[PDB]
Amino acid sequence: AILKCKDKKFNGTGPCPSVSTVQCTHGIKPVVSTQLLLNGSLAEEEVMIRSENITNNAKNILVQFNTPVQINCTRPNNNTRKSIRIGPGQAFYATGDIIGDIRQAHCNVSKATWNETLGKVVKQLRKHFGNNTIIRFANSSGGDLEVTTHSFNCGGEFFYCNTSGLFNSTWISNNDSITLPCRIKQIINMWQRIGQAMYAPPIQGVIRCVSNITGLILTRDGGSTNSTTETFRPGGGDMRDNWRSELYKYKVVKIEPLGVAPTRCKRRV
Amino acid sequence: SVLTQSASVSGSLGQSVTISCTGPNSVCCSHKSISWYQWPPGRAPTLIIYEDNERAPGISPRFSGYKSYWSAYLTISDLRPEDETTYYCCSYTHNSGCVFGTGTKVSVLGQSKANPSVTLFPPSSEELQANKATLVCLISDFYPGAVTVAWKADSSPVKAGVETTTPSKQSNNKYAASSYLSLTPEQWKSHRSYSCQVTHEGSTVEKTVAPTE
Amino acid sequence: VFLGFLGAAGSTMGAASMTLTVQARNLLSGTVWGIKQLQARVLAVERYLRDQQLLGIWGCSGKLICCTNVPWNSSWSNRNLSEIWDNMTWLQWDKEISNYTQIIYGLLEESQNQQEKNEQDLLALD
Amino acid sequence: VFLGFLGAAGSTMGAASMTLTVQARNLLSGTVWGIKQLQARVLAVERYLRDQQLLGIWGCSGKLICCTNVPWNSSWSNRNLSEIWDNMTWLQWDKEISNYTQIIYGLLEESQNQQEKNEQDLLALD
Amino acid sequence: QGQLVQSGAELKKPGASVKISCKTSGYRFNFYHINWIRQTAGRGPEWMGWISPYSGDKNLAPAFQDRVIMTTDTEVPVTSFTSTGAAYMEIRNLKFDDTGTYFCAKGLLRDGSSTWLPYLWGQGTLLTVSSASTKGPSVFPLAPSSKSTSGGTAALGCLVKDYFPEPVTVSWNSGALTSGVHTFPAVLQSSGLYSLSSVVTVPSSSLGTQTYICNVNHKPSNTKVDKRVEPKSCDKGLEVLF
Amino acid sequence: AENLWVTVYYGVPVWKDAETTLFCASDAKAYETEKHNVWATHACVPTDPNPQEIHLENVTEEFNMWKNNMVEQMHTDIISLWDQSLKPCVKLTPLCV
């Protein structure tokens, strides 16, 4: 059986009062993405902030939104593809002429809703760090392009969107949109590849996708000093976090039906 | 009450004793279940039996019960010393509620007596700084649980300021009662002596003191 | 009434001993993915047969409830009837008797063959 | 006493007919290597079920020892009781009756369905 | 199985109201009923009613139908078979007769003919419905005295001569010494005020090595007192032992 | 009557915590996607037209999502599934130039 925590305020660890058995999980689509996780199922009441060990900075924080914050993304260039005969049977898909202007890949989110939803996480965060506390948001500290930027697929090509504009805030105790630029790669090295890589063919034409942000993988700064100013930064790296984000409702158990117990009864002679 | 218990019953040690729990048909006993409790005065009770004969967890085999068509009873065997206490029963069914009886005290005998441990504490220097003057006659470790506290004043008893109380079962199956009394502060160097008599059946004890301190 | 598979999880062992045919029911019927399917398909019959194996090496191929001739060692539980059938749940109850279930099974194994070796003697003389 | 799985190999068919529940016991539960495991895991349930198949198409789902209504054709063995139960071993005994085991099984097959077709008539009239 | 602690004592003037709480631990709160019974003097013991933490079903006596309301709080779990819940009982009107002890007690079984039967009980809660105002406990010491001058024995303790209402604690040095834990009940003065004492057996030889602190409180009106007994004796028989 | 006897029960509602190989389910529209494009939707079994999840009343269960397997299993399934897809796909060996 698979057992499903139907409690709408569960942090993922401990006794769950509302439980149900079920054969299969829900429709868990494999969105592989860093920073913000997208198109996932969202919380029913509160913006739940889940972690293994919250006190320890080494462990990341899984934020699950309550409201979807729609983020539109695009590659504005009408790219063209030509096919090159390596031969025989082998055929490389080259990137041909760019038809029209040469623009920049990017994503837009509402500054209004981001304000609103970043306010929700703060209301929740202060439940763990004190009522009289400053909680500001900062960009990535430094590392691989795989993790220093919101990575995703969009129309068949891979994106690398600067999240500095989103994580750039400050929060005290008490109408346009956010244009955020992106990069694009074709030879990709996902899932910490080592001996093999993959060339993602040019996708002919103009590309745009629309998606909700379902969560975040945030990271707190361990300098501390008991300061009421502990800031946060977006993280990623390990991709199990993403499936961890959707599979928190589930657990697998082994059924054992052979009960033995005393009742006043002897079998016949 | 409507559910009629017995007043009191008796038995030796390692002996057997019973107790009735009768009532009218409106309460007992046909088409009705009966329980049984050991309820010590001023302390939480303890459930013994239910559904007439079913013994609760942590109940020695000696305890037993039977419901006749007209009356219910409880029988206790292998009488131990701590069984000397007050008991209650209750009429109940699945959907309805409980109806406690009248009350029965158990008086176990065949039990050795005890010499009282008396220790009188006179009023301290701080107590008189009010001004109020009293005494603290205390008595402990005695059987049976019954005494009488008397006093005197110049070849005649005391006709005022008395506050006597009842005994109570202790943690070691013994009984202990207290007694106080107030005297005027001008009756110290003026009045000679004063007795604090506390009579017992086995022997007699008292704590007499003359104010000259 | 009909609760569902495992529905009497938090029900008393008496009430849960009603819905036995429901848990017993949903227990059989219900190239990357292809291999997963296969070692799950065998696992289910292996796990199922291992229980029928036990019921059969006892006398309880009936089955569901089956009485026996091995008496209850009070050391195992020692609780009264009411407080397990009209009180405790099987999830709970399982963890108490868990320490000796395989020792209990052994008592059952010898007892069944002992029945058979005996019953042949009855039909033999009669 | 408890000898072990197959321990009564060189024991008399009487003494070996005691320890039946031990041989019946250790008979189920117990990518190169991965495939070996799988066609061994199915082989064990196939081979096991083929015996339950027989016991079931006879009346002997009990099982262990099960009497029947087909009488012993002396041609098969013709030996006396003592010299097979208190003398011979099953390893030995198997090779004698081996020539007609499948013919014997056929006698059993018809006899069981004959019982059922009959017993319905009893419960029918009564 | 698990303990069942309750609220402390309190006084309420007649024609008023009251609410008695009762916490749960060591057992599944929703799995058993919660009963409430009073040990009032007049009618002896009497069962108010019960309520199911699960279903919310209430069954009160006529004596407490129009007068009382059963209340139950949400269950928060410890493990799969353990929890931490609570229950209450609002008595609307207050009479002279309501003066007495009050108990909460959980049900016997989860199913059966004796489902709600009060098996496990609380330690008790007190109520004194009275027009009289609260009085603090005037505490004083006791001059050490002996029992047997030959046996090698001594004794000392604290005194609480006048207060209202009951009850009162009897701890020692923040609950350290568990030797000679003795206590006497109070006695009522002719005017309507209580009076009690307490004592503990000790050896003579030790005087300065022993620390005397009877950290005792009287909760109905938030009062905390601490006192120490001095070595000035009273009976000559104690000073001979030294 | 005092003497009790063990009687065995088959179909008792009780489970032990486990790990095991699960399997995938997807819907008909995923196969209607055709174009030989989606990964492993084909080998993947279908879903249920009327799915049912039986609520278990009166029971609590100690979850831990940071010590789960079916996310490690999934993570793995995704990496494998993906890597099996690239075997037929052409090698860009000589593009390294």
Ligand SMILES: *[C@@H]1O[C@H](CO)[C@@H](O[C@@H]2O[C@H](CO)[C@@H](O[C@@H]3O[C@H](CO[C@H]4O[C@H](CO)[C@@H](O)[C@H](O[C@H]5O[C@H](CO)[C@@H](O)[C@H](O)[C@@H]5O[C@H]5O[C@H](CO)[C@@H](O)[C@H](O)[C@@H]5O)[C@@H]4O)[C@@H](O)[C@H](O[C@H]4O[C@H](CO)[C@@H](O)[C@H](O)[C@@H]4O[C@H]4O[C@H](CO)[C@@H](O)[C@H](O)[C@@H]4O)[C@@H]3O)[C@H](O)[C@H]2NC(C)=O)[C@H](O)[C@H]1NC(C)=O
């Ligand atoms: C979070 O979730 C959101 C929501 O799902 C995700 O957004 C998705 O993004 C996808 C891209 O990443 C996007 O998929 C592309 O859509 C392109 C647009 O055209 C499609 O959509 C429109 C509507 O938006 C639809 O009208 C089109 O066709 C309809 O009608 C025809 C018949 O005329 C049907 O055949 C078709 O199924 C569809 O039916 C619809 O209408 C009928 C009524 O008429 C309804 O009854 C139906 O129910 C249905 O609603 C298009 O379907 C599209 O151009 C892209 O197509 C390429 O890719 C697909 C891959 O499957 C392939 O099949 C195509 O052939 C094509 O690839 C090949 O052709 C190219 C040239 O033709 C060539 O260059 C390529 O190399 C290939 O060879 C693609 O389908 C998707 O639509 C949206 N979701 C929605 C709901 O719109 C978001 O991505 C998620 N977030 C993240 C991070 O992933």
Ligand SMILES: *[C@@H]1O[C@H](CO)[C@@H](O[C@@H]2O[C@H](CO)[C@@H](O[C@@H]3O[C@H](CO[C@H]4O[C@H](CO)[C@@H](O)[C@H](O[C@H]5O[C@H](CO)[C@@H](O)[C@H](O)[C@@H]5O)[C@@H]4O)[C@@H](O)[C@H](O[C@H]4O[C@H](CO)[C@@H](O)[C@H](O)[C@@H]4O[C@H]4O[C@H](CO)[C@@H](O)[C@H](O)[C@@H]4O)[C@@H]3O)[C@H](O)[C@H]2NC(C)=O)[C@H](O)[C@H]1NC(C)=O
């Ligand atoms: C990520 O992307 C998503 C989408 O991918 C974005 O969400 C979209 O946001 C836009 C606005 O920013 C939404 O459009 C809105 O549509 C409203 C409804 O319009 C329909 O109904 C009216 C009748 O009321 C019809 O007349 C319309 O059809 C006409 O217009 C279309 C073109 O739009 C023509 O092709 C047709 O032939 C018709 O001529 C639609 O069917 C609309 O009310 C709204 O604003 C209009 O009204 C205001 C006045 O209140 C005007 O000022 C404004 O200019 C609009 O005027 C249009 O409509 C009037 C009639 O109302 C016409 O007479 C005009 O000529 C004009 O066409 C607005 O247009 C869209 O629905 C929404 N989509 C989704 C899925 O959410 C996200 O914002 C984006 N997010 C980020 C972060 O990037």
Ligand SMILES: *[C@@H]1O[C@H](CO)[C@@H](O[C@@H]2O[C@H](CO)[C@@H](O[C@@H]3O[C@H](CO[C@H]4O[C@H](CO[C@H]5O[C@H](CO)[C@@H](O)[C@H](O)[C@@H]5O)[C@@H](O)[C@H](O[C@H]5O[C@H](CO)[C@@H](O)[C@H](O)[C@@H]5O)[C@@H]4O)[C@@H](O)[C@H](O[C@H]4O[C@H](CO)[C@@H](O)[C@H](O)[C@@H]4O)[C@@H]3O)[C@H](O)[C@H]2NC(C)=O)[C@H](O)[C@H]1NC(C)=O
């Ligand atoms: C989850 O766990 C919980 C807790 O462990 C568990 O709840 C227990 O469920 C058992 C049943 O399995 C309950 O035990 C039964 O109680 C029956 C009650 O009988 C009736 O009367 C009740 C009291 O009414 C009095 O007061 C009112 C007003 O004051 C007055 O009108 C009445 O006349 C009477 O004086 C009443 O509360 C109760 O109400 C229930 O049922 C009605 C419908 O009838 C419904 O409307 C209510 O909402 C409520 O559900 C009822 O009317 C009792 O009859 C029953 O006794 C039968 O069985 C025994 C053997 O078991 C037989 O010997 C006997 O002859 C009867 O046939 C049994 O005692 C127990 O009280 C619950 N405990 C708690 C704490 O809730 C859940 O079932 C569990 N659920 C799961 C899925 O596991």
Ligand SMILES: *[C@@H]1O[C@H](CO)[C@@H](O[C@@H]2O[C@H](CO)[C@@H](O[C@@H]3O[C@H](CO[C@H]4O[C@H](CO)[C@@H](O)[C@H](O)[C@@H]4O)[C@@H](O)[C@H](O[C@H]4O[C@H](CO)[C@@H](O)[C@H](O)[C@@H]4O[C@H]4O[C@H](CO)[C@@H](O)[C@H](O)[C@@H]4O)[C@@H]3O)[C@H](O)[C@H]2NC(C)=O)[C@H](O)[C@H]1NC(C)=O
């Ligand atoms: C993710 O996203 C972040 C944030 O967007 C990004 O950080 C930014 O990186 C860029 C480099 O890629 C930093 O460089 C800036 O570039 C602009 C653009 O240059 C134009 O303008 C200058 C003159 O201003 C021209 O010389 C030039 O040719 C271009 O036309 C510069 O404007 C920035 O310079 C400012 O600071 C200088 C030093 O102080 C000043 O001399 C200059 O005038 C600019 O003005 C600033 O200072 C003024 C006072 O002197 C003040 O009044 C102004 O308001 C302003 O503050 C600068 O060189 C850019 O600084 C980074 N942004 C931040 C916030 O640090 C990350 O790089 C991206 N991720 C990755 C991986 O790249």
Ligand SMILES: *[C@@H]1O[C@H](CO)[C@@H](O[C@@H]2O[C@H](CO)[C@@H](O[C@@H]3O[C@H](CO[C@H]4O[C@H](CO)[C@@H](O)[C@H](O)[C@@H]4O)[C@@H](O)[C@H](O[C@H]4O[C@H](CO)[C@@H](O)[C@H](O)[C@@H]4O[C@H]4O[C@H](CO)[C@@H](O)[C@H](O)[C@@H]4O)[C@@H]3O)[C@H](O)[C@H]2NC(C)=O)[C@H](O)[C@H]1NC(C)=O
């Ligand atoms: C994250 O998001 C934030 C917005 O939330 C965005 O911040 C923007 O930064 C730019 C700078 O890069 C802001 O532009 C100006 O910044 C200066 C900074 O001055 C400081 O530093 C100088 C030394 O260089 C000090 O001398 C000075 O005291 C400051 O410490 C500001 O001074 C500017 O504001 C002045 O003008 C305003 C309008 O009149 C006044 O209301 C305000 O009070 C400021 O006046 C003060 O300074 C004067 C001297 O400059 C002095 O004479 C006055 O008396 C007074 O003291 C101006 O803000 C830009 O405004 C910021 N955005 C917003 C909305 O404020 C980040 O860029 C973004 N980051 C990323 C990566 O996306």
Ligand SMILES: *[C@@H]1O[C@H](CO)[C@@H](O[C@@H]2O[C@H](CO)[C@@H](O[C@@H]3O[C@H](CO[C@H]4O[C@H](CO[C@H]5O[C@H](CO)[C@@H](O)[C@H](O)[C@@H]5O[C@H]5O[C@H](CO)[C@@H](O)[C@H](O)[C@@H]5O)[C@@H](O)[C@H](O)[C@@H]4O)[C@@H](O)[C@H](O)[C@@H]3O)[C@H](O)[C@H]2NC(C)=O)[C@H](O)[C@H]1NC(C)=O
């Ligand atoms: C990105 O984000 C977008 C959103 O911006 C996502 O799109 C949205 O996705 C969801 C889920 O797929 C869709 O919701 C569907 O809605 C169907 C509604 O039909 C049913 O409900 C009717 C109303 O029922 C209400 O009233 C009854 C009383 O009779 C209540 O009992 C009931 O609970 C309902 O009340 C609830 O809702 C109201 C608001 O309406 C609240 O105020 C209440 O408090 C309460 O919560 C009913 O009459 C009718 O008969 C139906 O039963 C539903 O069936 C279906 O299952 C699903 O929930 C949105 O439609 C969809 N919206 C848009 C614009 O796309 C998107 O999925 C996400 N991801 C991506 C990739 O884009």
Ligand SMILES: *[C@@H]1O[C@H](CO)[C@@H](O[C@@H]2O[C@H](CO)[C@@H](O[C@@H]3O[C@H](CO[C@H]4O[C@H](CO)[C@@H](O)[C@H](O)[C@@H]4O)[C@@H](O)[C@H](O[C@H]4O[C@H](CO)[C@@H](O)[C@H](O)[C@@H]4O)[C@@H]3O)[C@H](O)[C@H]2NC(C)=O)[C@H](O)[C@H]1NC(C)=O
């Ligand atoms: C979330 O994560 C935080 C840490 O980020 C945890 O908080 C710590 O909790 C522990 C107890 O659980 C606290 O206690 C400390 O334990 C240290 C153990 O290290 C010793 O033992 C290992 C064993 O392998 C050795 O390898 C190692 O070298 C050490 O010898 C102690 O070292 C700590 O200091 C004590 O010992 C030293 C001498 O070694 C003394 O000088 C010190 O004075 C002191 O006595 C200490 O005992 C620890 O302090 C906590 N740290 C923080 C930052 O909070 C949380 O427990 C975790 N949450 C959960 C739910 O697990």
Ligand SMILES: *[C@@H]1O[C@H](CO)[C@@H](O)[C@H](O)[C@H]1NC(C)=O
């Ligand atoms: C959130 O929105 C308000 C709207 O005016 C804006 O003023 C504020 O600065 C935003 N929050 C932060 C932290 O900037």
Ligand SMILES: *[C@@H]1O[C@H](CO)[C@@H](O)[C@H](O)[C@H]1NC(C)=O
């Ligand atoms: C913080 O203060 C708010 C004030 O309304 C309160 O509701 C909340 O419970 C407090 N949280 C913590 C963790 O103190």
Ligand SMILES: *[C@@H]1O[C@H](CO)[C@@H](O)[C@H](O)[C@H]1NC(C)=O
């Ligand atoms: C169990 O209950 C029965 C009910 O009659 C009783 O006779 C028996 O003594 C009880 N057993 C224990 C151990 O309490």
Ligand SMILES: *[C@@H]1O[C@H](CO)[C@@H](O)[C@H](O)[C@H]1NC(C)=O
């Ligand atoms: C079984 O019960 C007997 C007495 O009835 C006892 O002596 C024995 O120790 C019990 N078995 C075990 C394993 O304790």
Ligand SMILES: *[C@@H]1O[C@H](CO)[C@@H](O)[C@H](O)[C@H]1NC(C)=O
């Ligand atoms: C079986 O026995 C009969 C006589 O009892 C004999 O005629 C027959 O030949 C035997 N069967 C075989 C196969 O020999």
